[PDB]
C-alpha cells in the first residue's frame, strides 16, 4: 500500500509545488469562482502552515 501518516502529509505541504495553482485553475475560474482563494501567489500570508499545524497537535 502507498500510504502516508499525517506527519508526512503535513510536511510536504511546505513544498513549492503545494502552493502553485492547480492545473485546472482556468476552468475552475470559469465554473466555480465563488470558492477560489489566494489568487496572488506573491502573497503567502494566508497559506496553510503545515509545520505549525503539526506542532499544534500534542
Amino acid at each position: 500500500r502507498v500510504s502516508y501518516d499525517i506527519e508526512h502529509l503535513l510536511y510536504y505541504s511546505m513544498s513549492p509545488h503545494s502552493w502553485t495553482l492547480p492545473t485546472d485553475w482556468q476552468k475552475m475560474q470559469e465554473t466555480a469562482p465563488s470558492i477560489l482563494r489566494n489568487k496572488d501567489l506573491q502573497d503567502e500570508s494566508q497559506r496553510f502552515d503545515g509545520d505549525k499545524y503539526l506542532a499544534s497537535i500534542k
Partner: protein, 175 residues
C-alpha cells in the same frame, strides 16, 4: 515532478446552491489530483468549509465515483455520520481528507469518499463506504476515524445505510 504519488486518484466536488437545477445538476466537478503536493495546491486555493455558502457541500471521492446514492459504488453502501467553531470544523474536515488520501484505512477498497454538509442549524461530516452489510470493514473504518480525528466521547459516530436515508434516521452501527 518529484511529487509524492497517492495510491488513488481523488476528485473534489462542489454542490452549489441553485434551486433552478435538480440536486444532481448542482454537483460541480472542480478537479482531480493524485499526488500529495497537488492536494495541497488545491487546498491552498479553495475556501475552507467555514467560508462557503449555506446549503453547499464539499465532497472528495475516488475517481469515477460520484457523491450520490445513484452511483453503483454507493447503491449498497452507507456513511459514518459525525454530528457537529470555524477553526474546529475546518481542521476536522482536513483531518478526514488526510485520512483518505493517506490511505489510513486497511479496508481501502471499501472507501468511496467523504462529504461535509454546511447548513444553518448544524454541519455534518460523513465518510461514505461501499458495502453497508460489510460490518467488518465498516467498523474498522469507524475505529480509524475515531482514533485519527481524536473524537472525544462527547460527539457521536453512527453508521447509516443510504437506503434508509433516502426513505427518511436508522443507525445500524455506533462507535
Amino acid at each position: 515532478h518529484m511529487k509524492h504519488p497517492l495510491m488513488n486518484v481523488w476528485t473534489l466536488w462542489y454542490l452549489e446552491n441553485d434551486r433552478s437545477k435538480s440536486w444532481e445538476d448542482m454537483q460541480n466537478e472542480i478537479t482531480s489530483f493524485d499526488t500529495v503536493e497537488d492536494f495541497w495546491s488545491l487546498y491552498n486555493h479553495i475556501k475552507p468549509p467555514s467560508e462557503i455558502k449555506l446549503g453547499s457541500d464539499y465532497s472528495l471521492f475516488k475517481k469515477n465515483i460520484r457523491p450520490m446514492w445513484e452511483d453503483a459504488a454507493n447503491k449498497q453502501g452507507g456513511r459514518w455520520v459525525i454530528t457537529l467553531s470555524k477553526t474546529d470544523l475546518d481542521n476536522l474536515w482536513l483531518d478526514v481528507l488526510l485520512c483518505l488520501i493517506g490511505e489510513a484505512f486497511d479496508h481501502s477498497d471499501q472507501i468511496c469518499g467523504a462529504v461535509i454538509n454546511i447548513r444553518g442549524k448544524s454541519n455534518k461530516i460523513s465518510i461514505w463506504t461501499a458495502d453497508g452489510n460489510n460490518e467488518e470493514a465498516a467498523l474498522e473504518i469507524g475505529h480509524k476515524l475515531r482514533d485519527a480525528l481524536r473524537l472525544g466521547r462527547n460527539n457521536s459516530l453512527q453508521y447509516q445505510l443510504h437506503k434508509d436515508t433516502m426513505v427518511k434516521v436508522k443507525s445500524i452501527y455506533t462507535l
